[PDB]
Amino acid sequence: DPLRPVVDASIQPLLKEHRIPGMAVAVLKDGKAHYFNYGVANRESGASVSEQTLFEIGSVSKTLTATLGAYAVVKGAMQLDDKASRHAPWLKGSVFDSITMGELATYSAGGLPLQFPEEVDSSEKMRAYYRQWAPVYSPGSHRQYSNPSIGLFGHLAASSLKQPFAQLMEQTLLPGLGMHHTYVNVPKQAMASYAYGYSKEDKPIRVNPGMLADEAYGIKTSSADLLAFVKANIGGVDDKALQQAISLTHKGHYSVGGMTQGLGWESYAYPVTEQTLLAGNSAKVILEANPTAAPRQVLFNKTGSSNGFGAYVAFVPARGIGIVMLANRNYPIPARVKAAHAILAQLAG
Ligand SMILES: O=C(Cc1cccs1)N[C@@H](Cn1cc(C(=O)O)nn1)B(O)O
Ligand SMILES: [Zn+2]
Ligand SMILES: [Zn+2]
Ligand SMILES: [Zn+2]
Ligand SMILES: [Zn+2]
Ligand SMILES: [Zn+2]
Ligand SMILES: [Zn+2]
Ligand SMILES: [Zn+2]
Ligand SMILES: [Zn+2]
Ligand SMILES: [Zn+2]
Ligand SMILES: [Zn+2]
Ligand SMILES: [Zn+2]
Hints:
Entry title: Crystal structure of MOX-1 complexed with a boronic acid transition state inhibitor S02030
Bound molecules: ligand ZXM, zinc ion
Radius of gyration: 19 Å
PDB class: hydrolase
Keywords: serine beta-lactamase, inhibitor, hydrolase
Assembly: monomeric
Name: Beta-lactamase
């Protein structure tokens, strides 16, 4: 493959610097998938990474949850300007009478935190958490990146379609997108393809179920499946409702600096500087409340991490280019962004 030198040149330094046990990289260009696989999925077995290896993609899950939400809209089961409580009887009476589904989706409901408090470890406690939550900001005025926010969005979109979220994803949406090895619950027959994550102390680890984990950060997938999702986000899919769903995930709702927030995907004018891409993926944007501003060739991306795992996806529909990078080390986001940026610049020519 004459792309191998270019990918290796950006990826090998990451592997060495962060002692990354394994990484699966997939690149799209001119309709063609290219797979570059490094290292091991499992340091005990020494099993090689391939484009079939399953990794935890963490928050990249949010792009798939967002697509489910968009699908519920397309099917007429909900609208982004629905009040959250329209789709959850147990939110009737709360501030979620006056927060919208779109606001949940785009982390703009008013300061829902990054994570549930540790004590919120059950259905009952989760419902009470949301019912007792006090808005920090007016709905729509601040982006506070939030698992409880988009997690609730995903959970209520599923409810709007009268099916459990895991079932909708695994039986309808993901097979619809061409993603047959993408799971919220990895089945027995796929467990042998499931990587272990590696903590900073090199302990093997995998995600634990937390409240709304499935919706907010729970997807396990391969580089091949995630590149098919990228393909679907560029070339489209056969099913028309799905196609229209995907399109909805591309539209800008608001901007923070040079990043534009959509459903799941975060977008930039392309060509995009390394500086701009780093800023919109900065700790500031991830961790703090930032005021929303009016929204924006376009690059779409999403970062994802779990304990022991680090993922990144970026693509540029107008140029037919895309990259997936899945590792079983949670290595720093700036390193993901710089490597992706240099590889995509080489593909774009
Ligand atoms: O919430 C998750 C999954 C988890 C990772 C750690 C605990 S649950 N990931 C999202 C935000 N996050 C990233 C991180 C982190 O890496 O510390 N902690 N939280 B994400 O953006 O991938
Ligand atoms: Zn090489
Ligand atoms: Zn529920
Ligand atoms: Zn299938
Ligand atoms: Zn299969
Ligand atoms: Zn597959
Ligand atoms: Zn589960
Ligand atoms: Zn430590
Ligand atoms: Zn588009
Ligand atoms: Zn919106
Ligand atoms: Zn402010
Ligand atoms: Zn050129």
